[PDB]
């Protein structure tokens, strides 16, 4: 209420709250995970480091490309896996900032597609028992990725995500969030991304004791185990964070598992190629 | 004055007369009804034993105790087999007791908080976990030393020989027993009834009092984890009956994964789910440790 001798107290418009002294109305506060909050710089810095590490790794393999160790594994599949890993860290960068209309649509499917692509390369490569029945590898990878591509599309037609501008959490504070369209599409996406990884993890367990390329199957099953542990834990963390930290939880989970696939499968061979040039068509 | 309009009372105020002319303020520890016609008592929220969530965390923390008891029974019945004696059968026993202490610490988060419970909540778990870590570390270094032997032994007395095996663990635990003692005397935790954050609900929680000790504890329990891996890295070339690397680097990775994934919910949310996630994290870490190391051998 503004002037003297007020018969009643006027309410305030929906886009404002009321000063401590109830004299006049001021502007509401909008909260969202921003690029200047101290807790997002760590995530931005962490990711950038992962991107640089992937760039360095693709460096050594396509530079020392005329060596037995790199030629022992398939070069094209390695390039595809490195490209997928480069997109996962960069994808996480898509989860920080002011949620726009199109970002809410590109949040999940980008990571889903990249992770399906990376998992499919490891599958086409686990001891060739999978490949014995039966170039063909590219066709199988394309078929694996196409079912995720298709599920994304039917979903974008039948219900795109968009901003919400919630006003039912804090009366004074406006919350900007994303409404995840429908739930069946998300459930199917998670189910497929987990079912593929389950098969990959099993054949590799099965072929864990074969010492081919410095026992690479064991590292693959280690990476798959790391991925499960990370995401079985995602359940309670997100289920109890209320506010602007759901994006933080998602970013943390994505970053962990991406490093999980990169490190396990690459760092041993990265060390071998860069130092100790003493293995040439003998231990490979 | 004979002509007037009727306006509803604001939140937290009621009336019970025909022509109120004023809204009566609700007394303390009470809140207005839905229709602002009669005050009713507020609600107190805490992790109680009536709700099934409480019945659950308890019915897990009995299963863990039973499993640990079963495991110690094998190491007592089969206490002379080559593979049981391969691992230290002294320090393996002491670890199992520390794991029993670990499962128990969680049961101090269920029920209405009190002064002694709030004071004993964190130090017990911290001491137990660091005890387990110290046991693992000292066992690993002994075998590397045994297997890094050029010329033969020279222990002068057999019994004191096994004194080192036990005193090193106490030396490691001494730093946190110190920090716990000075902390408790110079600013003990205490209960605190909070009703400011939400109007209709009274929250019963504890108060850390001094927070700087809660940083030093994490720094120490974590520093020790960085040592378990390094030693685990250093212990990769040993034979199979004595090897213990994969197990070490998975248990501590699980510990880090859980306690770094659970940071934002603890930082933001308030109430009963914080204690819930703390209990679930403690249980997850303790099972992880138990089945990573002892189960392969209990199968064999
Ligand atoms: C949502 C929650 C997120 C939380 C963040 C967690 C991030 C961590 C996850 C992933 C990134 C890296 C993971 C790599 C795992 C290593 C796999 C492993 O299990 O290793 C295998 C061992 C066993 O080999 P073997 O004896 O069977 O073979 C013997 C064969 N012969 C005889 C020829 C030698 O070999 C070895 O080298 C053992 C050496 C130990 C390796 C050290 C582990 C590296 C950890 C890095 C990050 C940890 C801190 C996280 C940051 C947060 C701080 C609070
Ligand atoms: C982000 C980074 C630093 C995390 C740690 C990754 C590095 C340091 C770890 C993760 C997996 C580890 C490897 C696990 C298994 C083996 C096989 C063994 O015969 C040689 C050591 C070697 C090759 C380890 C070297 C160190 C290693 C590559
Ligand atoms: C990033 C992550 N999606 C997290 C939101 C899940 C969710 C958020 C909100 C509600 C629901 C619910 F409705 F399903 F419960 C689920 C993701 C993306 C793509 C593939 C993935 C594969 C494995 C693991 C995670 C994947
Ligand atoms: C149980 C816990 N006391 C509360 C910390 C809350 C927390 C919630 C979420 C993340 C974190 C942390 F990871 F940052 F620590 C802390 C504790 C007490 C004493 C020693 C500990 C050693 C390791 C882990 C926890 C320890």
Curated annotation (Swiss-Prot), chain A:
Changing residue 246 to W: Decreased activation by positive allosteric modulators. The chain crosses the membrane at residues 38-63, 76-95, 102-125, 136-158, 183-202, 219-241, 246-267. Changing residue 238 to A: Does not affect G-protein-coupled receptor activity. It comes from the Eukaryota. Disulfide bonds join 12-25. Residues 203-218 are annotated as: Intracellular loop 3 (ICL3). Residues 64-75, 203-218 are cytoplasmic. It is linked to Hypocalciuric hypercalcemia, familial 1: A form of hypocalciuric hypercalcemia, a disorder of mineral homeostasis that is transmitted as an autosomal dominant trait with a high degree of penetrance. It is characterized biochemically by lifelong elevation of serum calcium concentrations and is associated with inappropriately low urinary calcium excretion and a normal or mildly elevated circulating parathyroid hormone level. Hypermagnesemia is typically present. Affected individuals are usually asymptomatic and the disorder is considered benign. Hyperparathyroidism, neonatal severe: A disorder characterized by severe hypercalcemia, bone demineralization, and failure to thrive usually manifesting in the first 6 months of life. If untreated, NSHPT can be a devastating neurodevelopmental disorder, which in some cases is lethal without parathyroidectomy. Belongs to the G-protein coupled receptor 3 family. This is Extracellular calcium-sensing receptor. It comes from Homo sapiens (Human). The lineage of its organism: Eukaryota, Metazoa, Chordata, Craniata, Vertebrata. The chain holds residues 574 to 871 of 1078 of the full protein.
């Amino acid at each position: 209420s503004d002037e003297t001798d007020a018969s009643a107290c006027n309410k305030c418009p929906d886009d404002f709250w009321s000063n401590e002294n109830h004299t006049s109305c001021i502007a509401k506060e909008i909260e969202f995970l921003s690029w200047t909050e101290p807790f997002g710089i760590a995530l931005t810095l962490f990711a950038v480091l992962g991107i640089f590490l992937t760039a360095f790794v693709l460096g050594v393999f396509i530079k020392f490309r005329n060596t037995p160790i790199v030629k022992a594994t398939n070069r094209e599949l390695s390039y595809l896996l490195l490209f997928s890993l480069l997109c996962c860290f960069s994808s996480s960068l898509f989860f920080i900032g002011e949620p726009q209309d199109w970002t809410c649509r590109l949040r999940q499917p980008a990571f889903g597609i990249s992770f399906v692509l990376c998992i499919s390369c490891i599958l086409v490569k686990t001891n060739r028992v999978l490949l014995v029945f039966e170039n063909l590898q590219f066709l199988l990878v394309f078929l694996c990725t196409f079912m995720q591509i298709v599920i994304c599309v039917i979903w974008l037609y039948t219900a795109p995500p968009s901003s919400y501008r919630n006003q039912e959490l804090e009366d004074e504070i406006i919350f900007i969030t994303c409404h995840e369209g429908s739930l069946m599409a998300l459930g199917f996406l998670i189910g497929y991304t987990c079912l593929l990884a389950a098969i990959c993890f099993f054949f590799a367990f099965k072929s864990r004791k074969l010492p081919e390329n410095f026992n690479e199957a064991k590292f693959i099953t280690f990476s798959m185990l790391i991925f499960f542990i990370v995401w079985i834990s995602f359940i309670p963390a997100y289920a109890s964070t209320y506010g602007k930290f759901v994006s933080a939880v998602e970013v943390i989970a994505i970053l962990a598992a991406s490093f999980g696939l990169l490190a396990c499968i690459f760092f041993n061979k990265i060390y071998i190629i860069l130092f100790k040039p003493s293995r040439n068509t003998i231990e490979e | 004055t004979c002509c007037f309009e009727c306006v509803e009372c604001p939140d937290g105020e009621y009336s019970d007369e025909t022509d109120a002319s004023a809204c009566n303020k609700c007394p303390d520890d009470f809140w207005s009804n839905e229709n602002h016609t009669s005050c009713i008592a507020k609600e107190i929220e805490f992790l109680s034993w009536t709700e099934p969530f409480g019945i659950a965390l308890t019915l897990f923390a009995v299963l863990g105790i039973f499993l640990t008891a079963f495991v110690l029974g094998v190491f007592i019945k089969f206490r002379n087999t080559p593979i049981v004696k391969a691992t230290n059968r002294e320090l393996s026993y002491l670890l199992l007791f520390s794991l029993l202490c670990c499962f128990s610490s969680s049961l101090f988060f269920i029920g209405e908080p009190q002064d002694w419970t709030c004071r004993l909540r964190q130090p017990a778990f911290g001491i137990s976990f660091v005890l387990c870590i110290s046991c693992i570390l000292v066992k690993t270094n002994r075998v590397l030393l045994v297997f890094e032997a050029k010329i033969p032994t020279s222990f002068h007395r057999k019994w004191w020989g096994l004194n080192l095996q036990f005193l090193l663990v106490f030396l490691c635990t001494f730093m946190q027993i110190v920090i716990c003692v000075i902390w408790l005397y110079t600013a003990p935790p205490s209960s605190y009834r909070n009703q400011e954050l939400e109007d209709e609900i009274i929250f019963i929680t504890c108060h850390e009092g001094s927070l700087m000790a809660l940083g030093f504890l994490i720094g120490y329990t974590c520093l020790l984890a960085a040592i378990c891996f390094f030693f685990a890295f250093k212990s990769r070339k040993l034979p199979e009956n004595f090897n213990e690397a994969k197990f070490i680097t998975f248990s501590m990775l699980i510990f880090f994964i859980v306690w770094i994934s659970f940071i934002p919910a603890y930082a933001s949310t308030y109430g009963k789910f914080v204690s819930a996630v703390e209990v679930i994290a403690i249980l997850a870490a303790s099972f992880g440790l138990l089945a990573c190391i002892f189960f392969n051998k209990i199968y064999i």
